[PDB]
Design a protein around this ligand. Structure first.
Ligand SMILES: Nc1nc2c(ncn2[C@@H]2O[C@H](COP(=O)(O)OP(=O)(O)OP(=O)(O)O)[C@@H](O)[C@H]2O)c(=O)[nH]1
Ligand SMILES: [Mg+2]
Lengths: 45, 48, 35, 204, 96, 31, 159
RNA sequence: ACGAUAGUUACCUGGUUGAUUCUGCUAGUCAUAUGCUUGUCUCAAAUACCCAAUCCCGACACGGGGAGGUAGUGACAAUAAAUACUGAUACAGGGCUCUUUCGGGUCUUGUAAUUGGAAUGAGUACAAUUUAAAUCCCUUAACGAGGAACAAUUGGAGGGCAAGUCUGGUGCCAGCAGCCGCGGUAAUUCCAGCUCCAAUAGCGUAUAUUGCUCGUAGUU
RNA sequence: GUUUUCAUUAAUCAGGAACGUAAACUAUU
């Protein structure tokens, strides 16, 4: 889905899917970090 | 794809489309944490 | 192409170094568990 | 914890190499050179300092001038003439240095030459920049700009945060009394000279 | 060392001054003696031409070396109150 | 780990034990 | 990260900025405004706090010309962005009004004191021009594009 | 009414083991020391000048005041932003990219080329003004830009080089490297100013880091 | 088991009290 359209923010927490979606340019990764969420590769935030 | 300037996605502007995985969903219920409210408090923007 | 192959060989050297470091850290943790 | 960290940093700042003192119980007069380019007024500062200390108006002060400045310590002022042979002769001799800069004209090659001759030969304890000819100025914004740039270049030259005095006018042919009084406040109270190896082995 | 970030030292002897190859780490390493504690540790001068500014019996500041002899922990930062990279870049003269 | 378990205190069977600090920690968070 | 580097480079190129400190400055004030909008969306509708404070925030943004006069909801205040702020800067307004040929020409003009905003000349290119004051950007009277003296290279050449 | 009059109308299949494919291989400190750099404007953490304003004391309108106000330093922070803008012509044919690389993708890019325009604030500065007297501010006549300068820095990564030097060895190879070369210092004009990445009037480094049972006080 | 009685007497253990050649393959379910 993300490879086709690439408008999404992928919210995961497993490092396998995180490393899989870090290879493709321009999708942010949202993951919960025990107090709140944390967005990874979004430039505007 | 259009709206891609060298690994900078210009297609994502608010309201942010956020795909949710099962690991993220199980852990955001486990951490007593409301899903849309915490996503909006993280991004400071309206998510769908 | 030769410049790209040089930089790819450097990346593979770093990968082998980090693989050896993680292997020794894991087996240092396990060798205390089997002791 | 941070107090312990700062205490450890200062305790490491206090350290040096353990060199030998070789200072007697009745010490000789410490030697003050008055070094600068020609025409900057070294003889005028010599007249003004000896009038501050011993109240004697010298019309032509030459040679070393020994002067009692405290009950324990005393000084001697020697004005270096404008020759490089005398400057290289006295840079290995000087105990404290009064290094003169000519104000509006800026730095000179004789000043930079004596600074690096002194640094290569042996660095003494106290070198004081004395900046004169400030009255040859018309705009007091250009005055503080020249003071700032000369202070920063001197700080790059010898060390950061030195003492740079500003001697403004020439009233009675001598200097202003308050300016030379704070200059002598700085060069009157004193600390033991730095243990240089050449002066602590060879008798001069 | 100690509890501080930089230590001072006396350059006892430039070990490896007779090494052959120019940028050898044995050429770059220098045995110093720390003032506060008294022990002799070894430190890297950052460059072989920069070794010439380090003379014997000079007060030397040294810090950690964070990244051919793996395990020499310190590097010489200042020599006699003047920064060693400034001496190498010919910004300052060394007061002796 | 179980998802349904609440975050305040430990749970043993059907009995949930809250230490005296934890009920004070919630009263601190309210103020 | 490469996404942040390419985004900040697109901002610095598309609006003729000097470094990334100006980008981070605008992103900080935008995040402050957007945080205020999110805190006002926390409350329910028809609370008096949300009503009057959101009306104050929306009227402020419409008056400083960032938010469009069409859309006036707090969700669009959340949907605000740094491209809108850098568009409201003065230097891009000189480039878009066409007193200058490029954005770097506009920064050069504002630095060497040719344009004026209303009455007084403006020396700073990051002057946040409001919507009421957008129209009165023109060359000053002491500028050779405005009048007065023919200028410097003109004087050296005409001598 | 046709429908199991003893629900045995049950159980008669609990799923070893392997192959292949697709994934996976740190950042902040109001935290101390220290190194390099610093042109402009406000601003401020830390032996200067005067009673001119507000105030006080006296034979007393005048005499006298260590409150007060004025100025100077300052990369500890914090604020704004210079170090250039814009054309024409000539010439070259390549520039760029990647998953998949002796392969694919895209179409205008250059040059230490030749010339032309303007704009000018840092600084220099006549004045007048400000003020106890000065300074700053605001006004302001006159100068004030072509790089070899009115001279941007701090770090990191990488290529290219000798009749030079060193080390290893089953010739010519490899490694570390190389201010050091035959001559030559008023001699040389050379990668002529090597290429890329990051921050940019700021930036780096170091360290700290972020045996069982009974039984009492007690407890439920 | 009873066609038996007092109705909290109880639960837990700080302190204390009585009894005393070896090792070597491992609220329901
Ligand atoms: N305006 C002004 N004039 C000065 C100042 N200092 C010195 N002068 C004058 O400059 C002249 C130089 O005299 P000296 O000071 O004797 O020169 P010197 O270098 O000390 O003596 P030599 O080394 O013999 O020339 C004197 O006539 C002074 O009046 C100053 O600060 N301001
Ligand atoms: Mg003299």
């Amino acid at each position: 889905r993300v490879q086709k359209h690439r408008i999404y923010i992928v919210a995961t927490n497993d490092r396998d899917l995180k490393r899989r979606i870090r290879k493709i340019p321009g999708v942010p990764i949202m993951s919960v970090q025990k107090g709140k969420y944390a967005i990874e590769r979004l430039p505007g935030a | 794809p259009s709206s891609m300037f060298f690994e900078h996605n210009e297609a994502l502007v608010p309201p942010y489309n956020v795909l949710v995985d099962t690991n993220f969903l199980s852990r955001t219920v486990g951490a007593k944490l409301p899903l849309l409210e915490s996503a909006m408090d993280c991004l400071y923007a309206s998510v769908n | 192409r030769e410049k790209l192959k040089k930089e790819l060989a450097e990346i593979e050297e770093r990968r082998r170094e980090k693989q050896k470091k993680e292997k020794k850290e894991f087996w240092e943790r396990e060798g205390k568990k089997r002791k | 914890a941070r107090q312990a960290a700062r205490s450890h940093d200062i305790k490491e700042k206090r350290l040096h190499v353990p060199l030998v003192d070789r200072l007697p119980d009745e010490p000789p007069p410490r030697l003050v050179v008055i070094v600068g380019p020609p025409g900057v007024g070294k003889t005028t500062l010599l007249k003004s300092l000896v009038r501050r200390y011993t109240k004697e108006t010298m019309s032509d002060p030459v040679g070393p001038i020994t002067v009692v400045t405290s009950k324990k310590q005393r000084l001697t002022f020697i004005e270096c003439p404008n020759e490089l042979e005398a400057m290289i002769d006295m840079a290995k001799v000087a105990d404290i240095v009064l290094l003169m800069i000519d104000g509006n004209y800026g730095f000179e090659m004789e000043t930079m030459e004596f600074l690096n001759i002194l640094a290569n030969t042996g660095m003494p304890g106290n070198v004081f920049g004395i900046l004169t000819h400030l009255d040859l100025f018309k705009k007091p914004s250009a005055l503080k700009d020249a003071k700032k740039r000369l202070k920063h270049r001197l700080w790059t030259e010898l060390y950061q945060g030195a003492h740079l005095f500003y001697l403004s006018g020439v009233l009675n042919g001598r200097y202003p009394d308050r300016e030379i009084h704070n200059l002598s406040r700085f060069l009157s109270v004193m600390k033991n000279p730095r243990p240089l190896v050449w002066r602590n082995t060879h008798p001069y | 060392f100690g509890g501080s970030s930089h230590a001072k030292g006396i350059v006892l002897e430039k070990v490896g001054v007779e090494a052959k190859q120019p940028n050898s780490a044995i050429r770059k390493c220098v045995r110093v003696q720390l003032i506060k504690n008294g022990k002799k540790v070894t430190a890297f001068v950052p460059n072989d031409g920069c070794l010439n500014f380090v003379d014997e019996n000079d007060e030397v500041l040294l810090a950690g070396f964070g990244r051919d002899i793996p395990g020499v922990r310190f590097k010489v930062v200042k020599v006699s109150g003047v920064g060693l990279l400034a001496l190498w870049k010919e910004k300052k003269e060394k007061p002796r | 780990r179980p998802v349904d378990l609440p975050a305040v205190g430990r749970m043993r069977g059907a009995e949930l034990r809250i230490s005296a600090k934890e009920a004070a920690a919630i009263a601190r968070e309210v103020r | 990260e490469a996404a942040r580097l390419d985004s900040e480079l697109k901002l610095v190129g598309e609006y003729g900025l000097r470094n990334k400190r100006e980008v981070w400055r605008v992103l900080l004030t935008l995040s402050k405004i957007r945080r205020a909008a999110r805190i006002l969306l926390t409350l329910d509708e028809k609370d008096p706090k949300r009503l009057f404070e959101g009306n104050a925030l929306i009227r402020r943004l419409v008056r400083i010309g960032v938010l469009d006069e069409s859309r006036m909801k707090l969700d669009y205040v959340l949907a605000l962005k740094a491209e809108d702020f850098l568009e409201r800067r003065l230097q891009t307004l000189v480039y878009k009004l066409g007193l200058a040929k490029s954005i770097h020409h506009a920064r050069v003009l504002i630095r060497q004191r040719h344009i004026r905003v209303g009455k007084q000349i403006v020396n700073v290119p990051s002057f946040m021009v409001r919507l009421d004051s957008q129209k009165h950007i023109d060359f000053a009277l002491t500028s050779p594009f405005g009048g007065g003296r023919p200028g410097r290279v003109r004087r050296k050449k005409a001598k």
